[PDB]
């Protein structure tokens, strides 16, 4: 079941679907040290990210190989966008989970180096647009489909998924110099989104040593689930 029928109708059925498959709020707390708590939380975010992707209409239409290639290239973007998303109502704070909210200094003390600052930069870029939840899920799905993995074997198939999600965003906006410009403004945050994800990976790999090899960790979980 590839859920392709959701691309046929008015977009509101697709949006309703994205809203439903949005992961449940996680609780990071039960007493572990900050680093350990975040590590445990991270493992759960990885699994949730993978299950989320598989429920994105049209994703399953891609060859198994391309699904994995797409996921390996943007999983951090999806994850990071979730963090930014939970942080929007706050000021200069990061809601890693319902019950785990850190300011810049708290992030630094939790082993995140300067990621606190980098993540808040992303958060501020999104807060400036005052996202609604519908825009976030559409943008997130689009970020998944806008992967630029070097290992994609059917590039037009990925192109078509990306196009369909972009058109969904447009149709959603149109139905709330085209003022539906609203869509472009969301798209213009995608470069910072990708950069932020790269920054997170660089921090855990060290600079490129491999202290905390998240790509391997992700792959192992990916192939265990797919
Ligand atoms: C210090 O924070 C992390 C620790 C780990 C585990 C590592 S660190 C090491 O020394 N040993 C390992 O196993 C993994 C990832 C962490 O960062 C996050 C945790 C949770 C979320 C969410 N929601 C986002 C992040 C980020 F990656 F966006 F920073």
């Amino acid at each position: 079941h590839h859920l392709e029928v959701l691309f046929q109708g008015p977009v509101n059925a697709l949006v309703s679907h994205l809203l439903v498959v949005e992961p449940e709020k996680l609780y990071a707390m039960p007493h572990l040290p900050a680093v350990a708590t975040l590590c445990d939380l991270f493992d759960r975010e990885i699994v949730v990210t993978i299950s989320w992707a598989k429920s994105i209409p049209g994703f399953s239409s891609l060859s198994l190989s391309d699904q994995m290639s797409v996921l390996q290239s943007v999983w951090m973007e999806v994850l990071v966008l979730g963090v930014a998303q939970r942080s929007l109502p706050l000021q200069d704070e990061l809601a890693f989970a319902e019950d785990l909210v850190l300011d810049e200094e708290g992030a630094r003390a939790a082993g995140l180096g300067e990621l606190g600052a980098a993540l808040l930069q992303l958060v501020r870029r999104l807060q400036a647009l005052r996202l609604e939840r519908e825009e976030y899920v559409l943008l997130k799905a689009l970020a998944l489909a806008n992967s630029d993995s070097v290992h994609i074997e059917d590039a037009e198939a990925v192109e078509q998924l990306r196009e369909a999600l972009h058109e969904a965003l447009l149709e959603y906006e149109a139905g709330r110099g085209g003022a539906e410009r609203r869509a472009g403004r969301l798209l213009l945050t995608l470069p910072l989104l990708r950069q932020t994800a790269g920054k997170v990976l660089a921090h855990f790999y060290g600079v490129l040593e491999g202290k905390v090899p998240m790509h391997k960790l992700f792959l192992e979980m990916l192939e265990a689930m797919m």
Side-chain angles (χ1 to χ4, degrees):
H1 304 322
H2 298 145
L3 309 171
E4 306 231 303
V5 75
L6 292 171
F7 294 119
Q8 225 227 330
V11 63
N12 312 280
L14 169 55
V15 164
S16 163
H17 174 94
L18 298 174
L19 285 176
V20 163
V21 304
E22 186 54 22
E24 301 295 335
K25 347 306 157 320
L26 295 186
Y27 290 85
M29 310 301 184
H31 48 49
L32 297 164
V35 184
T37 299
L38 282 171
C39 287
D40 289 350
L41 171 60
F42 197 65
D43 290 334
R44 303 206 284 144
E45 278 294 321
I46 273 151
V47 166
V48 161
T49 296
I50 296 162
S51 297
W52 168 83
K54 296 180 186 186
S55 85
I56 292 301
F59 193 68
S60 315
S61 298
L62 301 173
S63 67
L64 212 210
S65 184
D66 282 352
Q67 286 173 54
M68 297 200 305
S69 276
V70 166
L71 264 174
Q72 284 179 266
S73 68
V74 297
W75 69 272
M76 181 63 76
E77 293 188 29
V78 170
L79 202 155
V80 155
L81 184 61
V83 172
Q85 132 70 20
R86 306 187 280 284
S87 309
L88 300 184
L90 304 178
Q91 158 162 134
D92 302 324
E93 295 187 302
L94 297 167
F96 286 97
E98 195 66 34
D99 55 353
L100 171 44
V101 168
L102 302 175
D103 59 6
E104 193 165 336
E105 288 183 350
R108 199 138 41 208
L112 298 173
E114 294 308 305
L115 293 178
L119 288 164
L120 285 168
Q121 197 173 351
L122 204 213
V123 175
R124 285 195 301 277
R125 186 80 199 243
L126 297 165
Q127 286 177 317
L129 306 181
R130 297 171 176 173
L131 261 67
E132 309 157 351
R133 189 171 185 70
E134 291 81 0
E135 294 178 311
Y136 154 71
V137 298
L138 284 151
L139 185 63
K140 177 159 75 158
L142 185 56
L144 168 73
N146 196 40
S147 153
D148 286 297
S149 171
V150 342
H151 307 292
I152 285 158
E153 71 196 359
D154 195 346
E156 78 174 67
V158 177
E159 182 180 61
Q160 99 158 18
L161 177 55
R162 182 208 307 141
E163 277 165 10
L165 290 163
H166 178 212
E167 167 78 18
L169 175 53
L170 256 14
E171 295 179 8
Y172 172 78
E173 294 294 1
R176 312 232 316 242
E180 315 125 276
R181 176 181 52 218
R182 173 67 183 179
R185 290 183 183 168
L186 310 175
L187 302 196
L188 285 162
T189 77
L190 293 173
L192 178 57
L193 171 58
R194 186 167 291 180
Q195 183 177 202
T196 305
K199 274 161 140 53
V200 172
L201 289 159
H203 171 80
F204 287 93
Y205 272 90
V207 284
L208 207 175
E209 329 187 61
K211 328 321 221 101
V212 186
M214 294 179 157
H215 289 306
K216 297 320 189 72
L217 172 72
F218 183 72
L219 207 201
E220 271 149 16
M221 186 51 53
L222 182 63
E223 66 192 15
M225 293 171 78
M226 310 209 64

